[PDB]
Write an enzyme that holds these catalytic residues in place. Structure first.
Site, mmCIF file in Angstrom:
data_model
loop_
_atom_site.group_PDB
_atom_site.id
_atom_site.type_symbol
_atom_site.label_atom_id
_atom_site.label_comp_id
_atom_site.label_asym_id
_atom_site.label_seq_id
_atom_site.Cartn_x
_atom_site.Cartn_y
_atom_site.Cartn_z
ATOM 1 N N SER A 1 39.746 19.017 42.095
ATOM 2 C CA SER A 1 39.608 20.710 42.159
ATOM 3 C C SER A 1 38.239 21.289 42.685
ATOM 4 O O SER A 1 38.048 20.848 44.052
ATOM 5 C CB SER A 1 39.572 21.189 40.122
ATOM 6 O OG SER A 1 39.665 22.703 40.315
ATOM 7 N N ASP B 1 50.799 24.434 40.116
ATOM 8 C CA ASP B 1 49.361 25.480 39.903
ATOM 9 C C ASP B 1 48.991 26.086 39.615
ATOM 10 O O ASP B 1 48.797 27.431 40.313
ATOM 11 C CB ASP B 1 48.125 24.430 40.859
ATOM 12 C CG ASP B 1 46.760 23.560 40.669
ATOM 13 O OD1 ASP B 1 46.039 25.076 39.878
ATOM 14 O OD2 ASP B 1 46.594 23.209 41.400
ATOM 15 N N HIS C 1 48.382 22.554 37.750
ATOM 16 C CA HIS C 1 46.987 21.785 37.919
ATOM 17 C C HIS C 1 46.399 20.046 37.935
ATOM 18 O O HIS C 1 46.177 19.937 38.974
ATOM 19 C CB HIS C 1 45.152 22.264 37.478
ATOM 20 C CG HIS C 1 44.554 21.681 38.374
ATOM 21 N ND1 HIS C 1 44.435 22.468 39.769
ATOM 22 C CD2 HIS C 1 43.510 22.036 38.187
ATOM 23 C CE1 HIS C 1 42.932 22.452 39.957
ATOM 24 N NE2 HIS C 1 42.116 22.242 39.136
#
Length: 262
Positions: free
Chosen positions: A132, A178, A209
């Site tokens: 991320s 995501d 995600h």
């Protein structure tokens, strides 16, 4: 005769198992320098010095999100440091500084006779991974440090998606569904931007995600690919050219692309 080649000739079975051939130990970094906290994973008797990988989590997240990579990578012959950032709200450039700090500490610990990783690391051979904003941090690390040998971020995000300067071999793990860093506006444009490197895009089918995080359900495939990429590029190990560069032809994968993958 490649001096960086370590361990048994790889098989699908061996790359897909939850652990590879080497026995893994770990310790907590007592005085972490330039970052929050770190855990160092390392193989015993890999048969020579191995490269190092620094792994960073994302916004609000901790070592637990990316923990599984430590033993998985280390068990194939890498020294892996998983970190906590100074603050969980740190942004990608700060994540990247902290990632490089962790690597420097690893290099430092290679020459401290009291460390369990004393003389175990080839400090000229390093890689970067992360989730991320930590994924964006890895891409930033790569852009700012072209001496790095490989990058393999997962569900990456940064403000910018232009990583056209990156010369580091880069594997992007993406998560199809995501909704935090959607593929169409982060991982894919990031991937498309990199024109100067060996690269790969591997999207996990139906992934949220967190599809490459600890406890994920595609550990066989994701672990195989991460280890294969790091083997091929960090160790120049052409035993892993096929594993690293191949389309897995798997229903677990919704999109696969790769370029300059020798």
């Amino acid at each position: 005769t490649n001096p960086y080649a370590r361990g048994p000739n790889p098989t699908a079975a061996s790359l897909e198992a939850s652990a590879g051939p080497f026995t893994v130990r770990s310790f907590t970094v007592s005085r972490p320098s330039g970052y929050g906290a770190g855990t160092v994973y390392y193989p015993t008797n890999a048969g020579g010095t191995v490269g190092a990988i620094a792994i960073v989590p994302g916004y609000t997240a901790r070592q637990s999100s990316i923990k599984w990579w430590g033993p998985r990578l280390a068990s194939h012959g890498f020294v892996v440091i998983t970190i906590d950032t100074n603050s969980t709200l740190d942004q990608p450039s700060s994540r990247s500084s902290q990632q490089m700090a962790a690597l420097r500490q690893v290099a430092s610990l290679n020459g401290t006779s009291s460390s369990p990783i004393y003389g175990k690391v080839d400090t000229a051979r390093m890689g970067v991974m992360g989730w991320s904003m930590g994924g964006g941090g890895s891409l930033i690390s790569a852009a700012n440090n072209p001496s790095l040998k490989a990058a393999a971020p997962q569900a990456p995000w940064d403000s910018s998606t232009n990583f056209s300067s990156v010369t580091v071999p880069t594997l992007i793990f993406a998560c199809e569904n995501d909704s935090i860093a959607p593929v169409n506006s982060s991982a894919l444009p990031i991937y498309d931007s990199m024109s100067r490197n060996a690269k790969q895009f591997l999207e996990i089918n139906g992934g949220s995600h967190s599809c490459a995080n600890s406890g994920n359900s595609n550990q066989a495939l994701i672990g195989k690919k991460g280890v294969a990429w790091m083997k091929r590029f960090m160790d120049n190990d052409t035993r892993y050219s096929t594993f690293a560069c191949e389309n897995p032809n798997s229903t677990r994968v919704s999109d696969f692309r790769t370029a300059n993958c020798s």
